[PDB]
Amino acid sequence: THRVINHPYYFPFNGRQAEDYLRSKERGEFVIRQSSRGDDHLVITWKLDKDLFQHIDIQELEKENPLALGKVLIVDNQKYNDLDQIIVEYLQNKVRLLNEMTSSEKFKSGTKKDVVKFIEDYSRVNPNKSVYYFSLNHDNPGWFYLMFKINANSKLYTWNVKLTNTGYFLVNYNYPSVIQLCNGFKTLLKSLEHHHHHH
């Protein structure tokens, strides 16, 4: 600490400029900035993919006096003792997970309009078979949405998924692996068709 202000990754720029600066750079780049309105809080900016940027507000605690540094930093609903661990434990997992998910064949970037036409078209080819897919949401960056259709005469169903630093969270269910998540749904779909719930 006591060096986060001049930290190597420290760069004074506006919110718009920060994204622009990272625009020419590659994915997985981050920066450290201080908010005048915060005074006791810091804001970090990072790039996800293409025209997509997100900001995270870092809150420090355990301050005994104005000259006392926050020995405890809260990030992602998690408590970290050292700043260095936060950067490494966040970028390493986020970079690998983001790259693994996007690099997944089960990843299509279709718009809301293209989603209906996509599911409807596919459903048309398979009216007697169910289908499920997921895509990136623009209204809520970082979160994933699951859409699926049982049949052409079936109503379109869409669910929401929460992204965490431990994997993927689906309606209060953590899936450490995307493969398990894919079946997880298939298993649920099978159970749903039988309306047997548990027994």
UniProtKB/Swiss-Prot annotation:
Residues 8-105 form the SH2 domain. Belongs to the SPT6 family. Coiled coil: none annotated. It is found in: Nucleus; Chromosome. The chain holds residues 1250 to 1440 of 1451 of the full protein. Present with 8890 molecules/cell in log phase SD medium. Interacts with CTR9. Histone H3-H4 chaperone that plays a role in maintenance of chromatin structure during RNA polymerase II transcription elongation thereby repressing transcription initiation from cryptic promoters. Mediates the reassembly of nucleosomes onto the promoters of at least a selected set of genes during repression; the nucleosome reassembly is essential for transcriptional repression. Essential for viability. The lineage of its organism: Eukaryota, Fungi, Dikarya, Ascomycota, Saccharomycotina. This is Transcription elongation factor SPT6.
